[PDB]
Design brief:
This protein is of the alpha+beta class. About 35% of the residues lie in helices and about 25% in strands. The chain is built from eleven helices and 18 strands. Bound molecules: AMP phosphoramidate and chloride ion (2 copies). Keywords: ATP-binding, Metal-binding, Nucleotide-binding, Signal, Stress response. One of its GO terms (molecular function) is ATP-dependent protein folding chaperone.
Length: about 375
């Protein structure tokens, strides 16, 4: 009976349930409404979600993340060759050409396919829903990026089956976000919808058309390597240079543990800067036992990220051009992804669309799961959300 919607994200995943026409986004064990798409292996245990992300800096080789970048891909693909520089964990090619992620678990070398790592994240999301409901959950709708090919979609579905889920359907992330806002029902005439999705690792812009409850993806564009992690890197690079000026040229970047600890604090300061004018980046005993402290204003963060923020409009202009339509023809702009909380990004999009207010009532890092939950309820025979 019970069907859930799961946003299986690059950096974070989210699970929702639509009951009685209302959608509940389910908080995990730590009270978090999203769960990191991280799986770690230690001498004693297999950690998933928050616990895995929290020990990543102390166990880099055996903490897996970004499996969505490998799922359904052949190890020889150029995107794998390029992305692998960003991973402290080992990835090798199997005889079937599939990527094999190599970790140490309980003193033993273990290998996993990307869909096996994703199945562990999906199993955690299934368990999050089950703890909340107090009952087993078998059915699910899982979302994927609109550009995912047949191999990537099938491997995502296989990850669901391995997790014990009966995958009712694989749907597109931009379409799930549009469904969450009821843009398929509220209109009932021709509607052009722009989905602006800026997450932790990726940026996706999708232009949809909705005529008579039917969504079609007209054009997609973005940058598979632009996200919140790149804005954190701008703060890291600044702090590394600031530490040099304060401590006689000492280079924090030569110690990978110092960089990871600094990156953790840079990301926290960035989030604070979305609702405050200032934030403090503090790392006690950062490098060579030296304490680090700096105050970052929202203006300085906006300056370091100025080009990256402005360049988010380029894929917007590209989808409009590909779809042969003017920006004035866009009926709704939906903000998806945790990075859309950055005020400067919201302002740039509003100004680009001539003052039009974007749809951001649903927590942007929850809108995809929210729409998947609605679709899961419809596919289960529940018409209450209509
Ligand atoms: N309040 C905030 N301001 C700025 N960025 C924020 C934020 N809350 C979350 N984020 C960012 O959102 C990114 C995660 O986006 P999210 O939509 O959850 O994940 P995903 N798997 O789709 O990439 C992270 O880089 C995080 O720093
Ligand atoms: Cl249900
Ligand atoms: Cl309940």
């Amino acid at each position: 009976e019970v069907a859930i919607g799961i946003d299986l994200g690059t950096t974070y995943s989210c699970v929702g349930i639509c009951r009685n026409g209302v959608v509940d986004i389910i908080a995990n064990d730590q009270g978090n409404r999203t769960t990191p798409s991280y799986v770690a292996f230690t001498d004693t245990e297999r950690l998933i979600g928050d616990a895995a992300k929290n020990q990543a800096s102390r166990n880099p080789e055996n903490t897996v993340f970004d499996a969505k970048r490998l799922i359904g891909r052949k190890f020889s693909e150029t995107t794998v060759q390029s992305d692998m520089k960003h991973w402290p964990f080992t990835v090798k090619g199997g005889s079937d050409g599939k990527p094999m992620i190599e970790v140490s678990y309980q003193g033993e070398k273990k290998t996993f396919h990307p869909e096996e790592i994703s199945s562990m994240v999906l199993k955690k999301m299934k368990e999050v829903a089950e703890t909340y409901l107090g009952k087993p959950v078998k059915n699910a709708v899982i979302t994927v990026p609109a550009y995912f090919n047949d191999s990537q979609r099938q491997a995502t579905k296989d990850a669901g089956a391995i997790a014990g889920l009966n995958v009712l359907r694989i749907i597109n992330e931009p379409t799930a976000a549009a469904i969450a806002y009821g843009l398929d029902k509220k209109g009932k005439g021709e509607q052009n919808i722009l989905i602006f999705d800026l997450g932790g690792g990726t940026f996706d812009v999708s232009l949809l058309t909705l005529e008579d409850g039917i969504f079609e993806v007209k054009a997609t564009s973005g940058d598979t390597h632009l996200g919140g992690e790149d804005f954190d890197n701008k703060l890291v690079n600044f702090c590394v240079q600031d530490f040099k000026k304060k401590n006689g040229g000492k280079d924090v970047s030569k110690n990978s543990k110092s960089l990871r600890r600094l990156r953790t604090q840079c990301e926290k300061a960035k989030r604070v800067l979305s609702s405050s004018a200032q934030a403090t980046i503090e790392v006690d005993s950062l490098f060579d036992g030296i304490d680090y402290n700096v105050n970052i204003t929202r203006a300085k963060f906006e300056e370091l990220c100025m080009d990256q923020f402005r360049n988010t409009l380029i894929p917007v202009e590209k989808v409009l051009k590909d779809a042969k339509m003017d920006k004035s023809q866009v009926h709704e702009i939906v903000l998806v992804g945790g990075s859309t909380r950055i005020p400067k990004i919201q302002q740039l999009i509003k100004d680009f669309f001539n003052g039009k207010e974007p749809c951001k009532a649903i927590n942007p890092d929850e809108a995809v799961a929210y729409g998947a939950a609605v679709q899961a309820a419809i596919l289960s025979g529940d018409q209450s959300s209509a």
